[PDB]
Amino acid sequence: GSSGSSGMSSTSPNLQKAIDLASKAAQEDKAGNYEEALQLYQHAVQYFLHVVKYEAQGDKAKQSIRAKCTEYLDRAEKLKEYLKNKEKKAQKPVKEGQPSPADEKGNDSDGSGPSSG
């Protein structure tokens, strides 16, 4: 009886890559690699989407993948805030846009004004 080795549905190349990518990202993070984990975390999603775009599978699959895209996307967002925190201090913007209050008060009332005078 020749075993009919056959079950796991033949997955697409784009999807497979997305999985491996995402997996690698984590492995790096734990190891201590954030800069590398970030990139991967991004790619994984990029591919995942492409699949659900045209090479999709089913309403059930779409969500299954999407859920991962959001998760990985959020995780990466953080690695960025950390990578920049250590990265060489970022110079401050000059003449970009300073905050200011609304049209100065209107009514006028008697009062004091303690200031350098």
Backbone as XML, in Angstrom:
<?xml version="1.0"?>
<chain id="A" units="angstrom">
  <residue number="1" name="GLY">
    <atom name="N" x="0.807" y="-1.207" z="0.000"/>
    <atom name="CA" x="0.000" y="0.000" z="0.000"/>
    <atom name="C" x="0.842" y="1.260" z="0.000"/>
  </residue>
  <residue number="2" name="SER">
    <atom name="N" x="1.093" y="1.802" z="-1.187"/>
    <atom name="CA" x="1.895" y="3.013" z="-1.320"/>
    <atom name="C" x="1.174" y="4.212" z="-0.711"/>
  </residue>
  <residue number="3" name="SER">
    <atom name="N" x="1.653" y="4.656" z="0.448"/>
    <atom name="CA" x="1.052" y="5.792" z="1.137"/>
    <atom name="C" x="0.829" y="6.955" z="0.175"/>
  </residue>
  <residue number="4" name="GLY">
    <atom name="N" x="-0.401" y="7.455" z="0.136"/>
    <atom name="CA" x="-0.725" y="8.563" z="-0.744"/>
    <atom name="C" x="-0.372" y="9.907" z="-0.137"/>
  </residue>
  <residue number="5" name="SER">
    <atom name="N" x="0.910" y="10.105" z="0.153"/>
    <atom name="CA" x="1.375" y="11.354" z="0.744"/>
    <atom name="C" x="0.768" y="12.555" z="0.024"/>
  </residue>
  <residue number="6" name="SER">
    <atom name="N" x="-0.275" y="13.128" z="0.618"/>
    <atom name="CA" x="-0.948" y="14.281" z="0.033"/>
    <atom name="C" x="-1.978" y="14.857" z="1.000"/>
  </residue>
  <residue number="7" name="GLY">
    <atom name="N" x="-1.800" y="16.126" z="1.356"/>
    <atom name="CA" x="-2.721" y="16.775" z="2.272"/>
    <atom name="C" x="-2.577" y="18.284" z="2.265"/>
  </residue>
  <residue number="8" name="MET">
    <atom name="N" x="-1.430" y="18.770" z="2.727"/>
    <atom name="CA" x="-1.171" y="20.205" z="2.774"/>
    <atom name="C" x="-1.344" y="20.832" z="1.395"/>
  </residue>
  <residue number="9" name="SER">
    <atom name="N" x="-2.350" y="21.691" z="1.263"/>
    <atom name="CA" x="-2.626" y="22.358" z="-0.005"/>
    <atom name="C" x="-1.402" y="23.132" z="-0.488"/>
  </residue>
  <residue number="10" name="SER">
    <atom name="N" x="-1.075" y="22.970" z="-1.766"/>
    <atom name="CA" x="0.074" y="23.651" z="-2.352"/>
    <atom name="C" x="-0.053" y="25.163" z="-2.197"/>
  </residue>
  <residue number="11" name="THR">
    <atom name="N" x="0.712" y="25.722" z="-1.264"/>
    <atom name="CA" x="0.686" y="27.157" z="-1.013"/>
    <atom name="C" x="1.458" y="27.917" z="-2.085"/>
  </residue>
  <residue number="12" name="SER">
    <atom name="N" x="1.159" y="29.205" z="-2.223"/>
    <atom name="CA" x="1.824" y="30.042" z="-3.214"/>
    <atom name="C" x="3.210" y="30.459" z="-2.732"/>
  </residue>
  <residue number="13" name="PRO">
    <atom name="N" x="4.065" y="30.873" z="-3.679"/>
    <atom name="CA" x="5.433" y="31.304" z="-3.376"/>
    <atom name="C" x="5.468" y="32.631" z="-2.626"/>
  </residue>
  <residue number="14" name="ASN">
    <atom name="N" x="4.569" y="33.539" z="-2.996"/>
    <atom name="CA" x="4.497" y="34.848" z="-2.356"/>
    <atom name="C" x="4.102" y="34.717" z="-0.890"/>
  </residue>
  <residue number="15" name="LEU">
    <atom name="N" x="3.084" y="33.905" z="-0.627"/>
    <atom name="CA" x="2.607" y="33.691" z="0.734"/>
    <atom name="C" x="3.691" y="33.050" z="1.597"/>
  </residue>
  <residue number="16" name="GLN">
    <atom name="N" x="4.252" y="31.949" z="1.110"/>
    <atom name="CA" x="5.301" y="31.242" z="1.837"/>
    <atom name="C" x="6.388" y="32.207" z="2.298"/>
  </residue>
  <residue number="17" name="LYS">
    <atom name="N" x="6.827" y="33.074" z="1.392"/>
    <atom name="CA" x="7.863" y="34.051" z="1.705"/>
    <atom name="C" x="7.432" y="34.951" z="2.858"/>
  </residue>
  <residue number="18" name="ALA">
    <atom name="N" x="6.169" y="35.365" z="2.840"/>
    <atom name="CA" x="5.632" y="36.225" z="3.886"/>
    <atom name="C" x="5.766" y="35.573" z="5.258"/>
  </residue>
  <residue number="19" name="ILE">
    <atom name="N" x="5.428" y="34.290" z="5.333"/>
    <atom name="CA" x="5.511" y="33.550" z="6.586"/>
    <atom name="C" x="6.943" y="33.515" z="7.109"/>
  </residue>
  <residue number="20" name="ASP">
    <atom name="N" x="7.853" y="32.996" z="6.291"/>
    <atom name="CA" x="9.259" y="32.907" z="6.670"/>
    <atom name="C" x="9.786" y="34.263" z="7.126"/>
  </residue>
  <residue number="21" name="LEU">
    <atom name="N" x="9.519" y="35.294" z="6.332"/>
    <atom name="CA" x="9.966" y="36.644" z="6.654"/>
    <atom name="C" x="9.536" y="37.039" z="8.064"/>
  </residue>
  <residue number="22" name="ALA">
    <atom name="N" x="8.234" y="36.978" z="8.318"/>
    <atom name="CA" x="7.693" y="37.325" z="9.627"/>
    <atom name="C" x="8.384" y="36.535" z="10.733"/>
  </residue>
  <residue number="23" name="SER">
    <atom name="N" x="8.526" y="35.231" z="10.521"/>
    <atom name="CA" x="9.166" y="34.362" z="11.503"/>
    <atom name="C" x="10.588" y="34.829" z="11.797"/>
  </residue>
  <residue number="24" name="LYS">
    <atom name="N" x="11.344" y="35.106" z="10.740"/>
    <atom name="CA" x="12.720" y="35.563" z="10.881"/>
    <atom name="C" x="12.789" y="36.834" z="11.721"/>
  </residue>
  <residue number="25" name="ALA">
    <atom name="N" x="11.897" y="37.776" z="11.434"/>
    <atom name="CA" x="11.854" y="39.036" z="12.166"/>
    <atom name="C" x="11.922" y="38.799" z="13.672"/>
  </residue>
  <residue number="26" name="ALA">
    <atom name="N" x="10.981" y="38.014" z="14.185"/>
    <atom name="CA" x="10.935" y="37.707" z="15.609"/>
    <atom name="C" x="12.263" y="37.134" z="16.090"/>
  </residue>
  <residue number="27" name="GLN">
    <atom name="N" x="12.711" y="36.065" z="15.440"/>
    <atom name="CA" x="13.969" y="35.422" z="15.802"/>
    <atom name="C" x="15.058" y="36.459" z="16.056"/>
  </residue>
  <residue number="28" name="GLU">
    <atom name="N" x="15.156" y="37.438" z="15.163"/>
    <atom name="CA" x="16.156" y="38.491" z="15.290"/>
    <atom name="C" x="15.922" y="39.315" z="16.553"/>
  </residue>
  <residue number="29" name="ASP">
    <atom name="N" x="14.715" y="39.854" z="16.684"/>
    <atom name="CA" x="14.361" y="40.664" z="17.846"/>
    <atom name="C" x="14.884" y="40.028" z="19.130"/>
  </residue>
  <residue number="30" name="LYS">
    <atom name="N" x="14.402" y="38.827" z="19.429"/>
    <atom name="CA" x="14.820" y="38.111" z="20.628"/>
    <atom name="C" x="16.342" y="38.056" z="20.727"/>
  </residue>
  <residue number="31" name="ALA">
    <atom name="N" x="16.990" y="37.706" z="19.622"/>
    <atom name="CA" x="18.444" y="37.619" z="19.583"/>
    <atom name="C" x="19.083" y="38.963" z="19.921"/>
  </residue>
  <residue number="32" name="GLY">
    <atom name="N" x="18.367" y="40.044" z="19.625"/>
    <atom name="CA" x="18.881" y="41.372" z="19.903"/>
    <atom name="C" x="19.006" y="42.220" z="18.652"/>
  </residue>
  <residue number="33" name="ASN">
    <atom name="N" x="18.498" y="41.703" z="17.537"/>
    <atom name="CA" x="18.558" y="42.420" z="16.268"/>
    <atom name="C" x="17.232" y="43.115" z="15.973"/>
  </residue>
  <residue number="34" name="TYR">
    <atom name="N" x="17.212" y="44.433" z="16.142"/>
    <atom name="CA" x="16.007" y="45.217" z="15.896"/>
    <atom name="C" x="16.007" y="45.786" z="14.481"/>
  </residue>
  <residue number="35" name="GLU">
    <atom name="N" x="17.131" y="46.377" z="14.088"/>
    <atom name="CA" x="17.261" y="46.961" z="12.758"/>
    <atom name="C" x="16.931" y="45.936" z="11.678"/>
  </residue>
  <residue number="36" name="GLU">
    <atom name="N" x="17.368" y="44.698" z="11.891"/>
    <atom name="CA" x="17.120" y="43.626" z="10.935"/>
    <atom name="C" x="15.684" y="43.120" z="11.044"/>
  </residue>
  <residue number="37" name="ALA">
    <atom name="N" x="15.208" y="42.971" z="12.276"/>
    <atom name="CA" x="13.851" y="42.496" z="12.519"/>
    <atom name="C" x="12.822" y="43.443" z="11.910"/>
  </residue>
  <residue number="38" name="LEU">
    <atom name="N" x="13.095" y="44.741" z="11.999"/>
    <atom name="CA" x="12.191" y="45.750" z="11.456"/>
    <atom name="C" x="11.933" y="45.510" z="9.973"/>
  </residue>
  <residue number="39" name="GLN">
    <atom name="N" x="12.989" y="45.605" z="9.171"/>
    <atom name="CA" x="12.876" y="45.397" z="7.732"/>
    <atom name="C" x="12.018" y="44.173" z="7.425"/>
  </residue>
  <residue number="40" name="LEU">
    <atom name="N" x="12.409" y="43.030" z="7.975"/>
    <atom name="CA" x="11.674" y="41.787" z="7.760"/>
    <atom name="C" x="10.198" y="41.960" z="8.100"/>
  </residue>
  <residue number="41" name="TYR">
    <atom name="N" x="9.929" y="42.478" z="9.293"/>
    <atom name="CA" x="8.558" y="42.695" z="9.740"/>
    <atom name="C" x="7.749" y="43.432" z="8.678"/>
  </residue>
  <residue number="42" name="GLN">
    <atom name="N" x="8.402" y="44.357" z="7.982"/>
    <atom name="CA" x="7.744" y="45.134" z="6.938"/>
    <atom name="C" x="7.493" y="44.278" z="5.700"/>
  </residue>
  <residue number="43" name="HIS">
    <atom name="N" x="8.541" y="43.613" z="5.224"/>
    <atom name="CA" x="8.434" y="42.760" z="4.046"/>
    <atom name="C" x="7.312" y="41.739" z="4.214"/>
  </residue>
  <residue number="44" name="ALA">
    <atom name="N" x="7.398" y="40.941" z="5.274"/>
    <atom name="CA" x="6.389" y="39.926" z="5.549"/>
    <atom name="C" x="4.998" y="40.412" z="5.156"/>
  </residue>
  <residue number="45" name="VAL">
    <atom name="N" x="4.628" y="41.588" z="5.650"/>
    <atom name="CA" x="3.322" y="42.166" z="5.350"/>
    <atom name="C" x="3.176" y="42.451" z="3.859"/>
  </residue>
  <residue number="46" name="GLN">
    <atom name="N" x="4.142" y="43.175" z="3.304"/>
    <atom name="CA" x="4.121" y="43.517" z="1.886"/>
    <atom name="C" x="3.667" y="42.327" z="1.046"/>
  </residue>
  <residue number="47" name="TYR">
    <atom name="N" x="4.309" y="41.183" z="1.254"/>
    <atom name="CA" x="3.974" y="39.973" z="0.515"/>
    <atom name="C" x="2.571" y="39.488" z="0.870"/>
  </residue>
  <residue number="48" name="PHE">
    <atom name="N" x="2.312" y="39.345" z="2.165"/>
    <atom name="CA" x="1.010" y="38.889" z="2.638"/>
    <atom name="C" x="-0.119" y="39.599" z="1.897"/>
  </residue>
  <residue number="49" name="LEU">
    <atom name="N" x="-0.023" y="40.922" z="1.815"/>
    <atom name="CA" x="-1.035" y="41.721" z="1.134"/>
    <atom name="C" x="-1.168" y="41.301" z="-0.327"/>
  </residue>
  <residue number="50" name="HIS">
    <atom name="N" x="-0.067" y="41.393" z="-1.066"/>
    <atom name="CA" x="-0.059" y="41.020" z="-2.476"/>
    <atom name="C" x="-0.888" y="39.760" z="-2.709"/>
  </residue>
  <residue number="51" name="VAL">
    <atom name="N" x="-0.704" y="38.768" z="-1.844"/>
    <atom name="CA" x="-1.435" y="37.511" z="-1.954"/>
    <atom name="C" x="-2.936" y="37.734" z="-1.816"/>
  </residue>
  <residue number="52" name="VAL">
    <atom name="N" x="-3.338" y="38.341" z="-0.703"/>
    <atom name="CA" x="-4.747" y="38.615" z="-0.448"/>
    <atom name="C" x="-5.318" y="39.574" z="-1.488"/>
  </residue>
  <residue number="53" name="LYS">
    <atom name="N" x="-4.432" y="40.196" z="-2.259"/>
    <atom name="CA" x="-4.846" y="41.137" z="-3.293"/>
    <atom name="C" x="-5.380" y="40.399" z="-4.517"/>
  </residue>
  <residue number="54" name="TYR">
    <atom name="N" x="-4.560" y="39.517" z="-5.076"/>
    <atom name="CA" x="-4.950" y="38.747" z="-6.251"/>
    <atom name="C" x="-4.828" y="37.250" z="-5.985"/>
  </residue>
  <residue number="55" name="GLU">
    <atom name="N" x="-3.689" y="36.844" z="-5.433"/>
    <atom name="CA" x="-3.447" y="35.438" z="-5.130"/>
    <atom name="C" x="-4.070" y="35.056" z="-3.790"/>
  </residue>
  <residue number="56" name="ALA">
    <atom name="N" x="-5.244" y="35.612" z="-3.511"/>
    <atom name="CA" x="-5.945" y="35.330" z="-2.264"/>
    <atom name="C" x="-6.373" y="33.867" z="-2.195"/>
  </residue>
  <residue number="57" name="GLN">
    <atom name="N" x="-7.065" y="33.508" z="-1.118"/>
    <atom name="CA" x="-7.532" y="32.140" z="-0.931"/>
    <atom name="C" x="-9.026" y="32.111" z="-0.627"/>
  </residue>
  <residue number="58" name="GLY">
    <atom name="N" x="-9.406" y="32.694" z="0.505"/>
    <atom name="CA" x="-10.804" y="32.723" z="0.892"/>
    <atom name="C" x="-11.064" y="33.654" z="2.060"/>
  </residue>
  <residue number="59" name="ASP">
    <atom name="N" x="-12.287" y="34.164" z="2.147"/>
    <atom name="CA" x="-12.661" y="35.073" z="3.224"/>
    <atom name="C" x="-12.032" y="34.639" z="4.545"/>
  </residue>
  <residue number="60" name="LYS">
    <atom name="N" x="-11.984" y="33.331" z="4.769"/>
    <atom name="CA" x="-11.407" y="32.784" z="5.992"/>
    <atom name="C" x="-9.900" y="33.015" z="6.034"/>
  </residue>
  <residue number="61" name="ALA">
    <atom name="N" x="-9.238" y="32.773" z="4.907"/>
    <atom name="CA" x="-7.795" y="32.958" z="4.815"/>
    <atom name="C" x="-7.426" y="34.437" z="4.869"/>
  </residue>
  <residue number="62" name="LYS">
    <atom name="N" x="-8.061" y="35.232" z="4.015"/>
    <atom name="CA" x="-7.801" y="36.666" z="3.964"/>
    <atom name="C" x="-7.615" y="37.235" z="5.368"/>
  </residue>
  <residue number="63" name="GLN">
    <atom name="N" x="-8.640" y="37.088" z="6.201"/>
    <atom name="CA" x="-8.588" y="37.586" z="7.570"/>
    <atom name="C" x="-7.389" y="37.008" z="8.315"/>
  </residue>
  <residue number="64" name="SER">
    <atom name="N" x="-7.253" y="35.687" z="8.272"/>
    <atom name="CA" x="-6.151" y="35.009" z="8.946"/>
    <atom name="C" x="-4.829" y="35.717" z="8.670"/>
  </residue>
  <residue number="65" name="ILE">
    <atom name="N" x="-4.605" y="36.071" z="7.409"/>
    <atom name="CA" x="-3.380" y="36.755" z="7.013"/>
    <atom name="C" x="-3.393" y="38.211" z="7.465"/>
  </residue>
  <residue number="66" name="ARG">
    <atom name="N" x="-4.472" y="38.916" z="7.140"/>
    <atom name="CA" x="-4.608" y="40.319" z="7.513"/>
    <atom name="C" x="-4.260" y="40.526" z="8.985"/>
  </residue>
  <residue number="67" name="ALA">
    <atom name="N" x="-4.856" y="39.712" z="9.849"/>
    <atom name="CA" x="-4.608" y="39.806" z="11.282"/>
    <atom name="C" x="-3.113" y="39.880" z="11.577"/>
  </residue>
  <residue number="68" name="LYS">
    <atom name="N" x="-2.333" y="39.080" z="10.859"/>
    <atom name="CA" x="-0.887" y="39.054" z="11.042"/>
    <atom name="C" x="-0.257" y="40.361" z="10.572"/>
  </residue>
  <residue number="69" name="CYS">
    <atom name="N" x="-0.743" y="40.877" z="9.448"/>
    <atom name="CA" x="-0.226" y="42.123" z="8.893"/>
    <atom name="C" x="-0.311" y="43.251" z="9.916"/>
  </residue>
  <residue number="70" name="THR">
    <atom name="N" x="-1.467" y="43.373" z="10.561"/>
    <atom name="CA" x="-1.680" y="44.412" z="11.561"/>
    <atom name="C" x="-0.777" y="44.201" z="12.771"/>
  </residue>
  <residue number="71" name="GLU">
    <atom name="N" x="-0.675" y="42.953" z="13.218"/>
    <atom name="CA" x="0.156" y="42.620" z="14.369"/>
    <atom name="C" x="1.617" y="42.968" z="14.104"/>
  </residue>
  <residue number="72" name="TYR">
    <atom name="N" x="2.164" y="42.416" z="13.027"/>
    <atom name="CA" x="3.554" y="42.665" z="12.662"/>
    <atom name="C" x="3.796" y="44.152" z="12.421"/>
  </residue>
  <residue number="73" name="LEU">
    <atom name="N" x="2.843" y="44.801" z="11.761"/>
    <atom name="CA" x="2.951" y="46.225" z="11.465"/>
    <atom name="C" x="3.096" y="47.037" z="12.748"/>
  </residue>
  <residue number="74" name="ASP">
    <atom name="N" x="2.271" y="46.720" z="13.740"/>
    <atom name="CA" x="2.310" y="47.418" z="15.019"/>
    <atom name="C" x="3.642" y="47.183" z="15.726"/>
  </residue>
  <residue number="75" name="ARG">
    <atom name="N" x="4.061" y="45.923" z="15.784"/>
    <atom name="CA" x="5.316" y="45.565" z="16.435"/>
    <atom name="C" x="6.473" y="46.387" z="15.874"/>
  </residue>
  <residue number="76" name="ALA">
    <atom name="N" x="6.606" y="46.386" z="14.551"/>
    <atom name="CA" x="7.670" y="47.133" z="13.890"/>
    <atom name="C" x="7.646" y="48.600" z="14.301"/>
  </residue>
  <residue number="77" name="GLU">
    <atom name="N" x="6.477" y="49.223" z="14.192"/>
    <atom name="CA" x="6.322" y="50.628" z="14.551"/>
    <atom name="C" x="7.127" y="50.960" z="15.803"/>
  </residue>
  <residue number="78" name="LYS">
    <atom name="N" x="7.123" y="50.042" z="16.764"/>
    <atom name="CA" x="7.851" y="50.235" z="18.012"/>
    <atom name="C" x="9.357" y="50.218" z="17.770"/>
  </residue>
  <residue number="79" name="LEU">
    <atom name="N" x="9.847" y="49.125" z="17.195"/>
    <atom name="CA" x="11.270" y="48.984" z="16.908"/>
    <atom name="C" x="11.840" y="50.274" z="16.328"/>
  </residue>
  <residue number="80" name="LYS">
    <atom name="N" x="11.006" y="51.008" z="15.598"/>
    <atom name="CA" x="11.423" y="52.266" z="14.990"/>
    <atom name="C" x="11.672" y="53.329" z="16.055"/>
  </residue>
  <residue number="81" name="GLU">
    <atom name="N" x="10.744" y="53.444" z="16.999"/>
    <atom name="CA" x="10.864" y="54.421" z="18.074"/>
    <atom name="C" x="12.091" y="54.134" z="18.935"/>
  </residue>
  <residue number="82" name="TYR">
    <atom name="N" x="12.475" y="52.864" z="19.002"/>
    <atom name="CA" x="13.629" y="52.456" z="19.794"/>
    <atom name="C" x="14.924" y="52.661" z="19.014"/>
  </residue>
  <residue number="83" name="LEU">
    <atom name="N" x="14.908" y="52.278" z="17.742"/>
    <atom name="CA" x="16.080" y="52.419" z="16.885"/>
    <atom name="C" x="16.477" y="53.885" z="16.743"/>
  </residue>
  <residue number="84" name="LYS">
    <atom name="N" x="15.479" y="54.763" z="16.722"/>
    <atom name="CA" x="15.723" y="56.194" z="16.594"/>
    <atom name="C" x="16.184" y="56.789" z="17.921"/>
  </residue>
  <residue number="85" name="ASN">
    <atom name="N" x="15.719" y="56.204" z="19.020"/>
    <atom name="CA" x="16.084" y="56.676" z="20.351"/>
    <atom name="C" x="17.588" y="56.556" z="20.575"/>
  </residue>
  <residue number="86" name="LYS">
    <atom name="N" x="18.173" y="55.477" z="20.066"/>
    <atom name="CA" x="19.606" y="55.243" z="20.208"/>
    <atom name="C" x="20.384" y="55.941" z="19.098"/>
  </residue>
  <residue number="87" name="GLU">
    <atom name="N" x="19.798" y="55.983" z="17.906"/>
    <atom name="CA" x="20.438" y="56.623" z="16.763"/>
    <atom name="C" x="20.890" y="58.037" z="17.113"/>
  </residue>
  <residue number="88" name="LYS">
    <atom name="N" x="21.913" y="58.516" z="16.414"/>
    <atom name="CA" x="22.443" y="59.853" z="16.650"/>
    <atom name="C" x="21.314" y="60.866" z="16.807"/>
  </residue>
  <residue number="89" name="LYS">
    <atom name="N" x="21.334" y="61.601" z="17.914"/>
    <atom name="CA" x="20.314" y="62.606" z="18.184"/>
    <atom name="C" x="19.905" y="63.326" z="16.902"/>
  </residue>
  <residue number="90" name="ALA">
    <atom name="N" x="18.605" y="63.551" z="16.745"/>
    <atom name="CA" x="18.085" y="64.233" z="15.566"/>
    <atom name="C" x="17.952" y="65.732" z="15.812"/>
  </residue>
  <residue number="91" name="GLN">
    <atom name="N" x="18.613" y="66.526" z="14.976"/>
    <atom name="CA" x="18.568" y="67.978" z="15.104"/>
    <atom name="C" x="17.127" y="68.478" z="15.128"/>
  </residue>
  <residue number="92" name="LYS">
    <atom name="N" x="16.902" y="69.587" z="15.824"/>
    <atom name="CA" x="15.570" y="70.171" z="15.927"/>
    <atom name="C" x="15.284" y="71.083" z="14.738"/>
  </residue>
  <residue number="93" name="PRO">
    <atom name="N" x="14.023" y="71.084" z="14.282"/>
    <atom name="CA" x="13.590" y="71.908" z="13.150"/>
    <atom name="C" x="13.573" y="73.395" z="13.489"/>
  </residue>
  <residue number="94" name="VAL">
    <atom name="N" x="13.984" y="74.220" z="12.532"/>
    <atom name="CA" x="14.014" y="75.665" z="12.728"/>
    <atom name="C" x="13.111" y="76.375" z="11.726"/>
  </residue>
  <residue number="95" name="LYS">
    <atom name="N" x="12.227" y="77.226" z="12.233"/>
    <atom name="CA" x="11.307" y="77.971" z="11.383"/>
    <atom name="C" x="10.374" y="77.026" z="10.631"/>
  </residue>
  <residue number="96" name="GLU">
    <atom name="N" x="9.904" y="75.992" z="11.322"/>
    <atom name="CA" x="9.004" y="75.017" z="10.717"/>
    <atom name="C" x="7.553" y="75.312" z="11.087"/>
  </residue>
  <residue number="97" name="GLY">
    <atom name="N" x="7.338" y="75.723" z="12.334"/>
    <atom name="CA" x="5.997" y="76.031" z="12.792"/>
    <atom name="C" x="5.886" y="76.030" z="14.304"/>
  </residue>
  <residue number="98" name="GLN">
    <atom name="N" x="5.884" y="77.220" z="14.897"/>
    <atom name="CA" x="5.784" y="77.351" z="16.346"/>
    <atom name="C" x="4.330" y="77.496" z="16.781"/>
  </residue>
  <residue number="99" name="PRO">
    <atom name="N" x="3.997" y="76.907" z="17.939"/>
    <atom name="CA" x="2.640" y="76.958" z="18.491"/>
    <atom name="C" x="2.263" y="78.353" z="18.979"/>
  </residue>
  <residue number="100" name="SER">
    <atom name="N" x="0.999" y="78.718" z="18.793"/>
    <atom name="CA" x="0.513" y="80.028" z="19.211"/>
    <atom name="C" x="-0.966" y="79.967" z="19.578"/>
  </residue>
  <residue number="101" name="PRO">
    <atom name="N" x="-1.364" y="80.781" z="20.567"/>
    <atom name="CA" x="-2.752" y="80.839" z="21.035"/>
    <atom name="C" x="-3.684" y="81.471" z="20.007"/>
  </residue>
  <residue number="102" name="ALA">
    <atom name="N" x="-4.971" y="81.522" z="20.335"/>
    <atom name="CA" x="-5.965" y="82.104" z="19.441"/>
    <atom name="C" x="-5.989" y="83.624" z="19.563"/>
  </residue>
  <residue number="103" name="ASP">
    <atom name="N" x="-6.797" y="84.267" z="18.726"/>
    <atom name="CA" x="-6.912" y="85.720" z="18.740"/>
    <atom name="C" x="-6.938" y="86.249" z="20.172"/>
  </residue>
  <residue number="104" name="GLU">
    <atom name="N" x="-5.921" y="87.027" z="20.527"/>
    <atom name="CA" x="-5.826" y="87.594" z="21.867"/>
    <atom name="C" x="-7.210" y="87.944" z="22.409"/>
  </residue>
  <residue number="105" name="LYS">
    <atom name="N" x="-7.348" y="87.905" z="23.730"/>
    <atom name="CA" x="-8.618" y="88.218" z="24.375"/>
    <atom name="C" x="-9.256" y="89.455" z="23.751"/>
  </residue>
  <residue number="106" name="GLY">
    <atom name="N" x="-10.536" y="89.665" z="24.041"/>
    <atom name="CA" x="-11.240" y="90.814" z="23.501"/>
    <atom name="C" x="-11.562" y="91.848" z="24.561"/>
  </residue>
  <residue number="107" name="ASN">
    <atom name="N" x="-12.572" y="91.564" z="25.376"/>
    <atom name="CA" x="-12.982" y="92.479" z="26.436"/>
    <atom name="C" x="-11.767" y="93.034" z="27.173"/>
  </residue>
  <residue number="108" name="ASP">
    <atom name="N" x="-11.965" y="94.144" z="27.876"/>
    <atom name="CA" x="-10.887" y="94.776" z="28.628"/>
    <atom name="C" x="-11.321" y="95.067" z="30.061"/>
  </residue>
  <residue number="109" name="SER">
    <atom name="N" x="-10.487" y="94.674" z="31.018"/>
    <atom name="CA" x="-10.787" y="94.888" z="32.429"/>
    <atom name="C" x="-9.541" y="95.336" z="33.187"/>
  </residue>
  <residue number="110" name="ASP">
    <atom name="N" x="-9.743" y="96.163" z="34.207"/>
    <atom name="CA" x="-8.637" y="96.664" z="35.015"/>
    <atom name="C" x="-7.952" y="95.527" z="35.764"/>
  </residue>
  <residue number="111" name="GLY">
    <atom name="N" x="-6.622" y="95.544" z="35.773"/>
    <atom name="CA" x="-5.869" y="94.508" z="36.455"/>
    <atom name="C" x="-4.393" y="94.834" z="36.553"/>
  </residue>
  <residue number="112" name="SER">
    <atom name="N" x="-3.630" y="93.937" z="37.170"/>
    <atom name="CA" x="-2.195" y="94.137" z="37.333"/>
    <atom name="C" x="-1.413" y="93.336" z="36.296"/>
  </residue>
  <residue number="113" name="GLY">
    <atom name="N" x="-0.162" y="93.729" z="36.073"/>
    <atom name="CA" x="0.671" y="93.039" z="35.107"/>
    <atom name="C" x="2.123" y="92.968" z="35.538"/>
  </residue>
  <residue number="114" name="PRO">
    <atom name="N" x="2.430" y="92.026" z="36.442"/>
    <atom name="CA" x="3.789" y="91.836" z="36.956"/>
    <atom name="C" x="4.735" y="91.270" z="35.901"/>
  </residue>
  <residue number="115" name="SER">
    <atom name="N" x="5.667" y="92.100" z="35.444"/>
    <atom name="CA" x="6.630" y="91.684" z="34.431"/>
    <atom name="C" x="7.871" y="92.571" z="34.463"/>
  </residue>
  <residue number="116" name="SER">
    <atom name="N" x="8.940" y="92.107" z="33.825"/>
    <atom name="CA" x="10.190" y="92.857" z="33.783"/>
    <atom name="C" x="9.944" y="94.299" z="33.351"/>
  </residue>
  <residue number="117" name="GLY">
    <atom name="N" x="9.753" y="95.179" z="34.330"/>
    <atom name="CA" x="9.510" y="96.578" z="34.033"/>
    <atom name="C" x="10.009" y="97.499" z="35.129"/>
  </residue>
</chain>
